[PDB]
Design an enzyme around this catalytic site. Structure first.
Site, PDB file in Angstrom:
ATOM      1  N   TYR A 250      -0.587   0.417  10.502  1.00 10.60           N
ATOM      2  CA  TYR A 250      -0.972   0.063   9.134  1.00 10.60           C
ATOM      3  C   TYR A 250       0.207   0.273   8.182  1.00 10.60           C
ATOM      4  O   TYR A 250       0.717  -0.706   7.594  1.00 10.60           O
ATOM      5  CB  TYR A 250      -2.238   0.865   8.837  1.00 10.60           C
ATOM      6  CG  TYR A 250      -2.858   0.664   7.481  1.00 10.60           C
ATOM      7  CD1 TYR A 250      -2.946  -0.584   6.825  1.00 10.60           C
ATOM      8  CD2 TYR A 250      -3.326   1.761   6.818  1.00 10.60           C
ATOM      9  CE1 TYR A 250      -3.491  -0.699   5.565  1.00 10.60           C
ATOM     10  CE2 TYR A 250      -3.875   1.689   5.534  1.00 10.60           C
ATOM     11  CZ  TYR A 250      -3.955   0.452   4.921  1.00 10.60           C
ATOM     12  OH  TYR A 250      -4.552   0.523   3.691  1.00 10.60           O
TER      13      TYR A 250
ATOM     14  N   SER B  68       0.851  -1.165   0.000  1.00 14.47           N
ATOM     15  CA  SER B  68       0.000   0.000   0.000  1.00 14.47           C
ATOM     16  C   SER B  68       0.890   1.218   0.000  1.00 14.47           C
ATOM     17  O   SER B  68       2.009   1.145   0.520  1.00 14.47           O
ATOM     18  CB  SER B  68      -0.883   0.002   1.171  1.00 14.47           C
ATOM     19  OG  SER B  68      -1.782   1.102   1.115  1.00 14.47           O
TER      20      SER B  68
END
Lengths: 255, 255, 256, 256
Positions: free
Chosen positions: D149, D136
């Site tokens: 994250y 990501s």
């Protein structure tokens, strides 16, 4: 790559030759170019004696495609030169001479093909695809490689500039740089040879005891593997690919 | 930075003078050079009028350090320009005008200060410190900074290539690169006027905030804050700090 | 410059541990050097505490002093590191987890316990409180026989910029900086190659050291001393505007 | 060239996951699609399984189907994701750990247990097999309220420059690659912008929505579907010499 007007410079070199034939393999409507008169072109519809350092050159490219297809939906800024030589022996004129072909090959091109690469962006959802050939040597700089690395570092950056700004000015022209490695071309056939002339190599096979192994993947690249993402970029596959650094380098740089 | 014969082009830059000041608490011998004939360049110990691409001009600055010291320890270039421009409307001259003041001021100047640089790594264990300013814009794409970013990209890259080549030829010269963000300078200044004249930002208040919010530190960098990082670079505390994207952004890039 | 700066350095009785303290005291900021060592002979280190850096109970006890003794922390220094050299295919799942725990979780717990004593750093120097996360070129680039290791470092790498960006536009004044050391000479690195040869990747420990040194353009490795002022700089206020950064002190090793 | 290429696919019922499936059977590669979901009509997918990737059980549920029915894995995919936004100072280490195993460990036993068939997947195929991991943007650049994250997606990025480099220098033919997507409008990425109000990141939801939209030099929020194209490339042997490197489909975000 269906119903896509393309063009590719330098496609009579090792990587160049394949990019045209594996772009008709992509079934894009290629136009080929090179410095040379005319010889054997496969797939490509049309060829132009071209040097990405010739502004008048480039116009001929625009006015052709203009009549020829009336749009341009791909562009692979490809033609470029690699040089190895002592820096406190290299002139400024050599430094430009590299950029000329590698950096200002990209610009005058895309300026001339700008009215065109507009039309092409519109008639496809994904967009007008623009592909610049930088390198790993523009990602990571190298020793005795000073002016060759600063070339592909602009061919790195100009891209970001071209994707983001063109996005700004509304245009849907995706731009994305390209980063190969130590490709098996007869260019590099006598560039390890030039690591020799600078002493870092006893023989041609001891510099060819570095380039393959600076690759984890452990071998000189081949000019075949390089078309695979080049079509990709040019096609509504990479619709959402702009500014990018598209890197195919055997894991040279990560390490 | 004891016994540091050090050179500071564009010393009358917003950033310029404040590095000059912030190397004196370290106790260095400064050499202020600029385009101006003579000003109150606060801090410096020898002043020159210095065109930064004039080849014979870097031979009047190599002259003085040769005269007074016969060594160059640090070499800090600085005189770096930014056009704000519409890519398709940009002259190539003006593209050619930026690589010259910035990228091409290194290729010349270092060669002429090179003689006294191989001295530095003999006079100092920690070596000789060459600092070409790069910047964030030469890291990452920024539209309508189309002819400015590519520059500092090579300014980013060459630093590497030089530093690497020198250490491959066992010079005790390291070469780094400072990458300040939108530094509260009259360079981060009236280019927000260009944006404006482009009609690209609405107001400076807008333009301010776009360059304020791309830093989650909120402030845009005071010129003396970059003082610390320059100093470190020159020192023998940075004796393992070669060919670095050692950063100073406040948060322009990593996010 | 390190004035008034109450600091917490982990791994102090390590190599890079000893040295950081020396230089920080040499800039004359109040070190509170910490390690797993039951007691440690560390030049200058105004304090010493047996501190398990994965342990909360640890950072607790760190904080006790830093509150009682200074009621603030001005420079948090996670130097506490382990390194695991092993084929992914053979590397147990827990081996991965033991590493991250000590090099990421280690770091996490105290930027949570000492976070109180860091918010005053937000106050005691405008130039923020200096978080100094020691990543590595493992945190930069990849490696064979360093799976869990590099991944762990790249969490450290990334955690930093997360904390650079959060702790910032939340008003808290705290810079988080990431140091990525290259080949540095310790009976850590002077023995991490053994493993490659223990594996057999390299014939000899001479050859273990060979491409090691040459993989940096400079051509050699790093002194523990040559990891000094980079922390100092980050902890120095000369860089009130310098957060989210990978401060790469590897001898160009990455860049070429 | 996705012919005679047995895949494995995780996060299958996931919204991108579904795009990724169609876009790979309409390329005629042999799909083994996997997810935790109880029920899944996974269009294109030859086989669906109910698989927990924090499980060698779940992973050897896959292994048998590729053991019995075929005899190789040419394109293993690890597509599962959790996308937490949290205050750093309101993340327990447990919530740090939850986002490890789904996101990072999932890739481990995925690649420890399937390693034999990855090898067997790399013998018939030229440039080799590929692992094409899903990081990501978070996994490269940083961003606040993504502490656990953006690390978790960084612990992807790097793991694979580990795994890329460790197999090639093992004389296997089993490539390891990664994508770092940008803002892809999914129910997966759904009302998470609410969180950027429950804390207070931007005033409203749709200016949080357009705040995310803003950044993108491309200007727009991508599609689930778009990932697949740059996944159909990496797996094929026309992306043979692509290894260790971080294939990026963000929409310009990182690059400015």
């Amino acid at each position: 790559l269906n119903n896509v007007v393309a063009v590719v410079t330098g496609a009579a070199g090792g990587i160049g030759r394949e990019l045209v034939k594996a772009m008709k393999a992509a079934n894009a409507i290629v136009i080929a170019t090179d410095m040379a008169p005319s010889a054997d072109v496969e797939g490509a519809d049309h060829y132009l004696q071209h040097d990405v350092t010739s502004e008048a050159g480039w116009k001929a490219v625009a006015a052709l495609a203009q009549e020829k297809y009336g749009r341009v939906d791909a562009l692979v800024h490809n033609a470029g030169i690699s040089i190895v030589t002592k820096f406190e022996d290299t002139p400024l004129s050599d430094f430009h001479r590299v950029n000329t072909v590698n950096v200002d090959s990209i610009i005058i091109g895309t300026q001339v093909l700008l009215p065109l690469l507009k039309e092409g962006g519109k008639a496809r959802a994904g967009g007008a695809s623009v592909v610049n050939f930088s390198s790993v040597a523009g990602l990571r700089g190298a020793a005795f490689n000073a002016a060759y690395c600063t070339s592909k570092a602009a061919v790195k950056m100009l891209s970001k500039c071209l994707g983001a700004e063109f996005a700004a000015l509304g245009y849907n022209i995706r731009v994305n740089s390209v980063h190969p490695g130590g490709i098996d071309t007869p260019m590099l056939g006598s560039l390890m040879d030039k690591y020799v002339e600078l002493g870092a190599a006893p023989s041609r096979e001891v510099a060819q005891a570095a380039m393959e192994m600076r690759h984890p993947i452990g071998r000189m690249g081949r000019p075949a593997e390089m078309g695979g993402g080049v079509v990709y970029l040019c096609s509504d596959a990479a619709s959402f690919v702009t500014c990018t650094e598209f890197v195919m380098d055997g894991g040279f740089s990560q390490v």
